[PDB]
Amino acid sequence: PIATPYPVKEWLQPKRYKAHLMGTTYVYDFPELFRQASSSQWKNFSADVKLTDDFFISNELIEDENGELTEVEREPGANAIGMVAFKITVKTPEYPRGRQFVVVANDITFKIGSFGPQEDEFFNKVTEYARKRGIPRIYLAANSGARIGMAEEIVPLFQVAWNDAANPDKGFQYLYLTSEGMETLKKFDKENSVLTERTVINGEERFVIKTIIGSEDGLGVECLRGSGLIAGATSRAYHDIFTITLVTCRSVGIGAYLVRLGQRAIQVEGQPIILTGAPAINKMLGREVYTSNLQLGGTQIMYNNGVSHLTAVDDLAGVEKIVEWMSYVPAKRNMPVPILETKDTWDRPVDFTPTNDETYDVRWMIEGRETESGFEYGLFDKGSFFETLSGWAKGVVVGRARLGGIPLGVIGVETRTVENLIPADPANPNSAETLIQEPGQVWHPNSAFKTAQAINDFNNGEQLPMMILANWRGFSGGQRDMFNEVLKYGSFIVDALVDYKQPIIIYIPPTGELRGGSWVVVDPTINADQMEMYADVNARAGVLEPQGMVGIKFRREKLLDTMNRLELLPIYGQISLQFADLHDRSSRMVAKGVISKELEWTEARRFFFWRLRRRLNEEYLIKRLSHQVGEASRLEKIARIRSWYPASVDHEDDRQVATWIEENYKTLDDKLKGLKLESFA
Amino acid sequence: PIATPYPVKEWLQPKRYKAHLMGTTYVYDFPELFRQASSSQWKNFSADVKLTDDFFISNELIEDENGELTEVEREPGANAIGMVAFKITVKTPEYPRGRQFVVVANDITFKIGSFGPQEDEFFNKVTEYARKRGIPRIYLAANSGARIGMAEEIVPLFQVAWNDAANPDKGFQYLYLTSEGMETLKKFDKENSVLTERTVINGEERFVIKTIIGSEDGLGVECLRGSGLIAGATSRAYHDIFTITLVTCRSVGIGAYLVRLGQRAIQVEGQPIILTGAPAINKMLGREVYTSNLQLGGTQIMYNNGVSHLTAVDDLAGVEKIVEWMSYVPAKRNMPVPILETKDTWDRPVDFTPTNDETYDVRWMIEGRETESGFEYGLFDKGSFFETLSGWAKGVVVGRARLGGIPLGVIGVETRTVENLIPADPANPNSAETLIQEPGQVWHPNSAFKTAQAINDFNNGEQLPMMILANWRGFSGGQRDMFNEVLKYGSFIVDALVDYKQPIIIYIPPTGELRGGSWVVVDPTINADQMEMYADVNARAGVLEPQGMVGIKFRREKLLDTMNRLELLPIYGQISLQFADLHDRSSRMVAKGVISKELEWTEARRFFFWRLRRRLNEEYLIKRLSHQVGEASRLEKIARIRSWYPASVDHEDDRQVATWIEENYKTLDDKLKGLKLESFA
Ligand SMILES: Cc1ccc2cc(CC3CCN(C(=O)c4c5ccccc5cc5ccccc45)CC3)ccc2n1
Numbered sequence A, B: 001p002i003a004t005p006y007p008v009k010e011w012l013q014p015k016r017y018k019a020h021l022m023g024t025t026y027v028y029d030f031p032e033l034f035r036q037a038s039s040s041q042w043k044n045f046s047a048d049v050k051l052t053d054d055f056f057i058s059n060e061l062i063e064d065e066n067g068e069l070t071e072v073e074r075e076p077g078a079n080a081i082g083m084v085a086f087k088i089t090v091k092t093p094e095y096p097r098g099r100q101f102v103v104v105a106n107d108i109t110f111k112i113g114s115f116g117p118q119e120d121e122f123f124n125k126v127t128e129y130a131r132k133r134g135i136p137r138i139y140l141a142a143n144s145g146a147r148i149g150m151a152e153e154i155v156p157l158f159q160v161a162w163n164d165a166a167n168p169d170k171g172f173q174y175l176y177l178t179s180e181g182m183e184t185l186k187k188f189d190k191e192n193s194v195l196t197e198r199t200v201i202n203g204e205e206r207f208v209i210k211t212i213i214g215s216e217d218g219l220g221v222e223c224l225r226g227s228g229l230i231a232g233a234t235s236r237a238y239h240d241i242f243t244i245t246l247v248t249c250r251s252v253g254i255g256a257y258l259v260r261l262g263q264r265a266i267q268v269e270g271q272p273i274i275l276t277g278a279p280a281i282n283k284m285l286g287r288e289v290y291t292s293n294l295q296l297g298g299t300q301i302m303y304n305n306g307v308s309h310l311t312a313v314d315d316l317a318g319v320e321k322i323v324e325w326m327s328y329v330p331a332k333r334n335m336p337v338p339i340l341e342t343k344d345t346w347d348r349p350v351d352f353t354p355t356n357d358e359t360y361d362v363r364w365m366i367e368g369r370e371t372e373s374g375f376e377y378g379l380f381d382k383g384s385f386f387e388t389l390s391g392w393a394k395g396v397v398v399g400r401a402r403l404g405g406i407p408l409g410v411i412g413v414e415t416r417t418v419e420n421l422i423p424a425d426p427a428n429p430n431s432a433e434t435l436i437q438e439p440g441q442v443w444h445p446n447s448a449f450k451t452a453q454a455i456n457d458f459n460n461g462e463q464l465p466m467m468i469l470a471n472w473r474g475f476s477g478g479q480r481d482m483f484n485e486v487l488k489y490g491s492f493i494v495d496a497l498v499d500y501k502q503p504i505i506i507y508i509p510p511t512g513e514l515r516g517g518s519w520v521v522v523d524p525t526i527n528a529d530q531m532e533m534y535a536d537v538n539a540r541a542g543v544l545e546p547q548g549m550v551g552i553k554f555r556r557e558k559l560l561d562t563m564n565r566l567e568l569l570p571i572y573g574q575i576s577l578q579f580a581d582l583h584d585r586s587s588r589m590v591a592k593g594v595i596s597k598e599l600e601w602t603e604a605r606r607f608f609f610w611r612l613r614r615r616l617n618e619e620y621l622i623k624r625l626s627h628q629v630g631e632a633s634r635l636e637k638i639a640r641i642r643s644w645y646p647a648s649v650d651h652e653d654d655r656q657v658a659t660w661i662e663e664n665y666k667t668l669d670d671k672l673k674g675l676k677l678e679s680f681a
């Protein structure tokens, strides 16, 4: 392409053109997408702020003579292996002074992005690099799976021991090498290339090959071993640092498993995540069952799956999303969650309010709702809601958000009925698309799964506190759902709660309720150390619902005894229904001590903003303590800390406690160093 | 029932009769079933051994004035709460000197086995009792879920504020109490029983009740709180001690969740595990959708589910199974796995051997097979195979077994095709039973799940080492299975491997193979600290299978170039197929260092018996070390230990290393105490 204003990048690095022909960004151009996505991130926070190019740095990482990773600046396309990495340091709204993370990616142009042992070694080496530093690990997947090959240096010289030269089709006994062959190999030091047993049959001296090894590396099982190496490496990383994967072109085999093992994944439309490919599958079934791999791993499969948390119209789009998702995550493992305050101050009422007699979208209660008569603010900061797993198990709504600047994970219940439409199985002539009516406020195996999954992804890497707008009638107990292991997924929820390490708020919203089974798996005693529960004054909760309570304790007979208040069943059965309901009031909860406080939705944002803030500070102090005595329970540590508050402080006053702490960090610190004489030997 | 030889137990304790009428054993008679099951356990080990009744002790546990559990001996039916517990100490074949465990159960006769807060408190108190001691916790579930009730002491005296006395059916404004009522309550100190706002309307002085609390405890949310308390308690216990649950009569709500949270569960035929019951569900759908709860939680639901690991023809049957399952579990958390040697010595060849050209039942390779020409021993001790999760995901076979006395978890691949038959959904007129062909040697979402589940249940509580007779072609990658999250369940496998704390052997059996994706999730590098892999000389393994390798690297053209060895495609394509295969040989694995050794099936039992034994001893030594320095990696600890072996010992000789260690425990011990001067201050 002659005469262009500036140099042709696809010509200086012809590999950049191949990448493009393959429908993906060339690996070396990715740090540029991040610098761009970072800049946008700034435009959106303060249109005014002036950015210098020194707000973003990218250094490629490569192994040195010792195999240790070091930074280098070399021309794109110099990579000798099919795996590349960059360490990135960027100043962002949440970390204006700078934050770092790593990017690892397949070079789709280097042997079609196949994973040979050397790639696996590099990928595992980069992952530990990140784990050790606690910084996030971003994997950009565009690969062909594990590398394969045969001992090509044996195909031209192998000889077959026919049954009779005359008619080959009669079969053969084995394969061998002539002295001539065994000789050729030795002239290239390639004797290890094969295992042969020497036995001479009448005519010539034949060497029967019993096993082909090949001089070339990356042919089989060694590629499989390296594969498992990184699968395990990723499994580990997910519990250690922030892990996220962008699929920019097909991702195969170990590639597909790496996407899931990292958990958090953003799939670019059209790029499939697959195990065995369509051609091969068809080839097996000897039929024309599938057309493209997208039928097997496109977004209509993985995004509906929960495997893919988000989709992206194109690469840059996915990057921006990663960059956005990261904006809620601590700079590095164990650092405080990044506070980011915006125009939507904490001090205000919650506008949008649900009504028992009219359907709403829980997202309104979360991020507010745009109205013709203006905008009604929701419970969280305007425009801070970052929903994830939106294509799967739509009974629940999960995402990140900000509460007066404080980032946290949010889980809400979708009250509207879901029309889950499952497409027919091509490999089965019978199969026909089925519609699944997933009724609102009811946990189903998939929505139970998503909830547990959400909590875990909030806890690992993200290390965020979380709020749950609990509002479920219960778990679906009919045959189909029960048969589909709904109990297993329900229990996953409890398990994730037991494992949670940050503050948790369980809050039953206004027209909401929490019944029997549902209340079980989310009750604060599941993890007293971090859980706290609140009920809105207009919520309801009890083992059963009025209809049920009467169906058991206010039967057909008892109703008559009260008919001694002077046919008329209709209005009396209604009286009993209302008699029960007076039992499920938040007031009773407070009385039975199963909730910390009853609240008023409109005033919620103010309460939670200071409750959360107070909590984060006390947690910070409990941790500082722990890194010393090494022997004391939470109940004792939190007590030693609260004994430091000025006598005049109301331990129950969140804002006050928080304020005194933030005004005395350095003073509280001195007291801790003063506790060094705590060396019990 | 007059004139019987001995006293009528159902009359002395009429509650025992109720229990029976309810189709279950009376709670107090359960320790007797255990003493019986224990005795059988002895008969089956040594028909000769004489047992005195002092080989089994059962002491009921109850809370004292401080709420602490203590042992008592009182008459059955004295329990003031609906929950009972017994501590059991029994001498058994594996622990002839005695072993202990706890039993907790619902009293189906005490308020229909409902969980009120007091029961929950007791159940949680018993669970910690066990966790602290590390002894197993056996839960016998027979319950009605969480307890419910209304403020009965308000139903006779509440008054309704009609719109007009004349016609009630016109509706009412609210409910209230007359001065007369408010007075009655005060004469019973039951004022807290209600929250009323006093406002007098023309006529009388009316107290409008805004919230009903009730003097009775165990009406609602307080029952829900206690429920979650134990769900979380069970969740925790499962990662701490050996947990197992027997369902002897329906198990509802929190009852159903406790069954799953404990994980290991044995369901007695006919007793359902359910959430909301059929009546209520029907009542909701306002239709006659379900007949019995067994449609919702019978064995045809939970056993096919994987929720129920085993079923039992009746109570005693379930007990025997628990008792048997426990025979492989350590006496208490962290004690050595119980060795139990029987007539089937370790020193022998493996008889039964699979053949590439004839279907077999992997169970034969495991526990041997009975033939007309005699019995052919399998890889493990004759009759020591205890299969579990047999009704679900039949693609894999999992169970416990013994190898020359050493107990371990076993996972085998079912080569036969499974005819998974799913029954139609009653709640759906369309629904019709579907047949699912699950082809052998292929992981499917359910068989992937079972495998991960097996590994985890082998690791937690059981604390057993494990062997995997790896032999899968790969994961099902077609649409249906891919769409059904097969990747999620596959990754669970890796996760469980990362978490494994005991020795692991991955062994590809004789006519077996391990291809691409399959090899990935089970490769030893996933957990080098505990994993070891072996390939039989007649197994195969590679990224692809020959058919595939040629379809890629030995195409239609290349085949012709080799046609230069003098239509005849058939036999040449066969040559290439065989050319590839010479690549997937165990010999190559050894060469590429991806396996520890290649083995001969018939000689396997001898090898593994000493490899496992050697390993258990070295592990024991690595642990002893750890409880000191507190700073040294495995690679360094195992090295300090092996530096103690006599110069003349072949570190690679399992039997020798094991023998020198068992002959020097006390001497090795002295050396460790000598390392006390390792107090780095
Ligand atoms: C297919 C399916 C299966 C189970 C489902 C369960 C629920 C939530 C449940 C519904 C049942 N429930 C009740 O309080 C309830 C009832 C609730 C609404 C109408 C009638 C009811 C009758 C009952 C009779 C006896 C005991 C309880 C009853 C508690 C909360 C919601 C949707 C469900 N969908």
Ligand SMILES: Cc1ccc2cc(CC3CCN(C(=O)c4c5ccccc5cc5ccccc45)CC3)ccc2n1
Pocket (backbone or CB within 6 Å): A276, A279, A280, A281, A283, A284, B439, B442, B473, B474, B475, B476, B477, B478, B515, B516, B543, B544, B545, B546, B547, B548, B549, B551, B552
């Ligand atoms: C519904 C379904 C979907 C996917 C499945 C996958 C397997 C195991 C796979 C089968 C595919 N495979 C092969 O080595 C293979 C082949 C294996 C057997 C016959 C033909 C093959 C053609 C291939 C062409 C290109 C690449 C690989 C091929 C590796 C192991 C087994 C059963 C499966 N069932």
